[PDB]
Amino acid sequence: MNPPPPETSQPQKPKRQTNQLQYLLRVVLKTLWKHQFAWPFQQPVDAVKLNLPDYYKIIKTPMDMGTIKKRLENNYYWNAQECIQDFNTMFTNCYIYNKPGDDIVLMAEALEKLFLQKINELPTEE
Numbered sequence: 183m184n185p186p187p188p189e190t191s192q193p194q195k196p197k198r199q200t201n202q203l204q205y206l207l208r209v210v211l212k213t214l215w216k217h218q219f220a221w222p223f224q225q226p227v228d229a230v231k232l233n234l235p236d237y238y239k240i241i242k243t244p245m246d247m248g249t250i251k252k253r254l255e256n257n258y259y260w261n262a263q264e265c266i267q268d269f270n271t272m273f274t275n276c277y278i279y280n281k282p283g284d285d286i287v288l289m290a291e292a293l294e295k296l297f298l299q300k301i302n303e304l305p306t307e308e
Contacts, residue, residue, distance in 0.1 A: 185238060187226050188245065190252035192259075201305045202262035207254040210300040214247060217296060219289040223247045223272060240279055245272040262304060269297055 199207075214220055225248045229237035238244070250268050252258075259265045276290040 183238075184226070184228060184230055185244070188249045190249060190258060191256050192253075195257040196260045199257055199259070200261060201308050203254060203259055203265060205303075205305055206262060206265050206301075207251075209303075210297065211247065211251055211254060213300055214293060214297060215251070217293055219293050220247065222286060222289060223276075223293060227275075234279075237279065241275045243271055243275070245269075245275060247272065262307065266301065273297070 215224070223246055226244055226246045227234070227237060227241075229235065245268050250265065250272070253268070254265065273290050273294045276286060280287045
């Protein structure tokens with residue numbers, strides 16, 4: 183049984199999005215979304231479809247790029263640290279559930295490498 187997807191709306195939004203969050207939306211997410219390995223990460227893991235009955239027994243905080251995109255677009259985040267941690271939760275969920283060497287893990291790692299390359303140029307918070 184799949185739980186509802188993570189919330190994408192925040193009833194207490196900041197008055198504005200920092201430059202860092204704008205960069206995360208317009209540069210980082212845009213770049214990751216179009217990567218050849220992005221596709222398994224653009225929506226929640228469907229553990230019914232994938233026949234993974236223990237997925238939520240193991241993964242306490244599901245996360246995916248679709249959720250992150252919506253959060254960025256909806257002014258859900260107060261700062262870049264929150265968003266960066268959501269990306270980190272997404273990648274590490276994959277590493278926790280799967281095994282070194284697995285195709286999905288190799289895909290996640292290449293996507294993560296790109297993520298780290300893109301946040302290299304994250305602006306100083308203003």
